[PDB]
UniProtKB/Swiss-Prot annotation, chain B:
Domain of life of the organism encoding this protein: Eukaryota
Protein name: PAN2-PAN3 deadenylation complex subunit pan3
Region described as Knob domain: 315-397
Keywords: ATP-binding, Coiled coil, Cytoplasm, Metal-binding, mRNA processing, Nucleotide-binding, Zinc, Zinc-finger
Function: Regulatory subunit of the poly(A)-nuclease (PAN) deadenylation complex, one of two cytoplasmic mRNA deadenylases involved in mRNA turnover. PAN specifically shortens poly(A) tails of RNA and the activity is stimulated by poly(A)-binding protein pabp-1. PAN deadenylation is followed by rapid degradation of the shortened mRNA tails by the CCR4-NOT complex. Deadenylated mRNAs are then degraded by two alternative mechanisms, namely exosome-mediated 3'-5' exonucleolytic degradation, or deadenylation-dependent mRNA decaping and subsequent 5'-3' exonucleolytic degradation by rgb-30/xrn1.
Positions in coiled-coil regions: 280-314
GO biological process terms on file: mRNA processing; nuclear-transcribed mRNA poly(A) tail shortening
Part of the full-length chain shown: 234 to 646 of 656
Organism: Neurospora crassa (strain ATCC 24698 / 74-OR23-1A / CBS 708.71 / DSM 1257 / FGSC 987)
Subcellular location: Cytoplasm
UniProt key word Iron-sulfur: no
Chain residues that bind ATP: 42-47, 69, 119-126, 173-174
Taxonomy of the source species: Eukaryota, Fungi, Dikarya, Ascomycota, Pezizomycotina
Amino acid sequence: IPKDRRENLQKKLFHMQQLLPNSGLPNLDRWHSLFPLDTKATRNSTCFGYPSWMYKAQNNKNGRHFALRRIEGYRLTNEKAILNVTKEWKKIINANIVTVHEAFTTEFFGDSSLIFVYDFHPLSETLYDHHFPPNKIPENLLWSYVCQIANALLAIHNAKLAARCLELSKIIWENNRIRLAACSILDVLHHDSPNRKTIEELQQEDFVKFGRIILALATNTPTLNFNNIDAALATIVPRYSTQLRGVLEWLIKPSAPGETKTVETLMPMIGARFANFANFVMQESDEKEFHLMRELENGRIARLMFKLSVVNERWSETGERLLLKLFRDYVFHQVDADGKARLDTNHYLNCLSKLDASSEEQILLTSRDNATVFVVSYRSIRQMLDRAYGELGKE
Amino acid sequence: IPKDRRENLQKKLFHMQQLLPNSGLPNLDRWHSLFPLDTKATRNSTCFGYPSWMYKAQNNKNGRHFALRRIEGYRLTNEKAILNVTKEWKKIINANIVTVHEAFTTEFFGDSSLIFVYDFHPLSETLYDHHFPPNNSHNKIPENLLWSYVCQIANALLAIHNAKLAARCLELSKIIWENNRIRLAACSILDVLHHDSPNRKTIEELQQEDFVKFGRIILALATNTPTLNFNNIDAALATIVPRYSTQLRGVLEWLIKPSAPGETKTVETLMPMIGARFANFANFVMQESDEKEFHLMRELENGRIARLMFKLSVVNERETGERLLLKLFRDYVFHQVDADGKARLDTNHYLNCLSKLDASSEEQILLTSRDNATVFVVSYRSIRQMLDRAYGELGKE
Ligand SMILES: Nc1ncnc2c1ncn2[C@@H]1O[C@H](COP(=O)(O)OP(=O)(O)OP(O)(O)=S)[C@@H](O)[C@H]1O
Ligand SMILES: Nc1ncnc2c1ncn2[C@@H]1O[C@H](COP(=O)(O)OP(=O)(O)OP(O)(O)=S)[C@@H](O)[C@H]1O
Ligand SMILES: [Mg+2]
Ligand SMILES: [Mg+2]
């Protein structure tokens, strides 16, 4: 657990518990301690047709943290069966889709608001805000985005559904991992609108919105228009590979001369980039595995110190336990040439690691009166510790 | 953190430390504590042309555990065979390839042996032994798992071929399995043992042999036939059509058959054939990596608990003052005895006390001194603040 990852995982735990008491936010029937997640001071109705609000809240029943998406000013009776379509989205298990649990309307916000509950992903930021704060992205990261979004659309389309909402502000970023964070919403907000589209047509719009998102990132232009669909498409050939340009072209262009666009057709176009991506995720999962084991090592190290602390100053004054006493002094009571304490976390860690591994390496244990000195190995010290601790269990 | 997952990580750590006191194995110039990994009492020379031995050993320099592949009865007749091979393979780092570090000869085994050192992956079992258990004899593997293998092996071949090299050794017994993660565990070996052989093959045909050996491995697993023969490359190929999808059959057929009518087989051509199965595979890996992320944060308490023990051990027994409560706190946590006088050992008590110390719990405890006249009512929160305070005053010096 190096410095950055350990404090990042602590920053995550800190974000999950994080509260803001004076905010003047209401408590729902099954939710409390609502925490505002919006990082910007402006809200527009371009994405949903209504203003949107984001919240982190605690469940009254299980105490775990969830994310709440609020759609301001939407009227719909809570008892309506349409809100239950989130149950179909719940069935979809995907790493690039934020799982939705349920949907309900509420009036605790002083109006008519619709609430979607999602998994809470700590330290998440929108893909827009991450790449466009108020200078080009590497192609590997762009392909990582292409592979992740395609993976999401694959599961969605095969579930006889569509993304509907596919934009930069509605995709959350967290350590290069992206997820669709507004699914199942438009399913409700467009259930009985004029000019309803088919799930077949909506699935096609996904591919178009897909291409535009990546194209925007590739051309480093936040606002994207139709008048430059071929202008910005030709700007990526020297900077990025022709393969990247080819995928963007396929996604954006209305490919309907003899056939309709399908996710299965998109996959071979990606091809080798999937292997590269999968390789990276596998290696990152490997790194998480070592940190897991290091942390489990810490537990074994803590349990060794438990035994050691039980024995010390408890019989314990003199004997084979006297060496255990002197061993503790060796590890934690180190002082400099002046006489001042030499605090050293590294020394503590490596001493106990060698004790846990029963290292054959030897160390010098000086007695209280610097007259007697013990040449002893970690292996011997470990065996004395287990021996003495067991003799206390006989009682 | 499910039951099996915690015990899996504990089985790994226990496997790395595992020793054999009665062993008659020597210590090498740079290696010691050699531990036998072989699951069988018999060794044949089919895989390498020489008997092979597997060992876990500790590095004298860094103290970490590595895997050692020993090739019995090998004399170095050319230093080019080790150096021209290992200089290229050492550079290749892949998630589906066991990293090789170096190769050297030794005589400590009472003979002339060649030694390869690899990364040590705990709890690893050969893909053969996992799907064909050793202690049983002669019922199908799920298709998703077969596709997982195809993606992983293809990923390995992708890195290998792009380095102008070949797997050479691509068989069930030379691939290690660990929680559905497979790795090529015999790379760079045949590169050395065949470095100056009479009938040296081209790097391109050896690469073609990779695809064939690829196909046979998956086909063997799909047909539940450990040994695979040339006479049933089309017979066993027809056993998979009702049980598995036609796509799998198409890939296996493509891999095994000498596909050179209009083009020669390349990994880039294999990728679109797998296609959507890569999305499925990557999704699972992402999902498992997500599950580890949540499990990590929960486990982080061990570091926080251990660092607290560091502070507590530094301060204690270095006599009187505010640290006297820290001394009495240690007595409360680890020195519990009954009215009778017997030791009250409790691993749970130790863990939960420190959890409350780590959480700065508002829960209160009773601290009676040796002199019973004064007793301190204090919470874990206050004790926690006293500990950091005392530990900080030692940093002033
Ligand atoms: N499912 C989620 N889990 C955790 N955090 C989230 C989730 N969804 C959104 N957030 C965070 O909430 C913040 C705001 O959410 P997004 O609303 O949808 O963007 P919004 O920028 O504030 O844009 P406006 O104008 O509504 S469209 C972002 O910074 C995210 O980091
Ligand atoms: N790099 C490694 N890291 C950890 N364990 C390994 C590694 N490589 C091999 N092993 C294990 O070592 C054991 C024996 O190695 P493998 O020898 O090559 O099996 P072996 O099948 O009996 O084949 P050989 O003797 O040619 S017949 C296996 O159970 C593996 O799981
Ligand atoms: Mg918002
Ligand atoms: Mg062997």
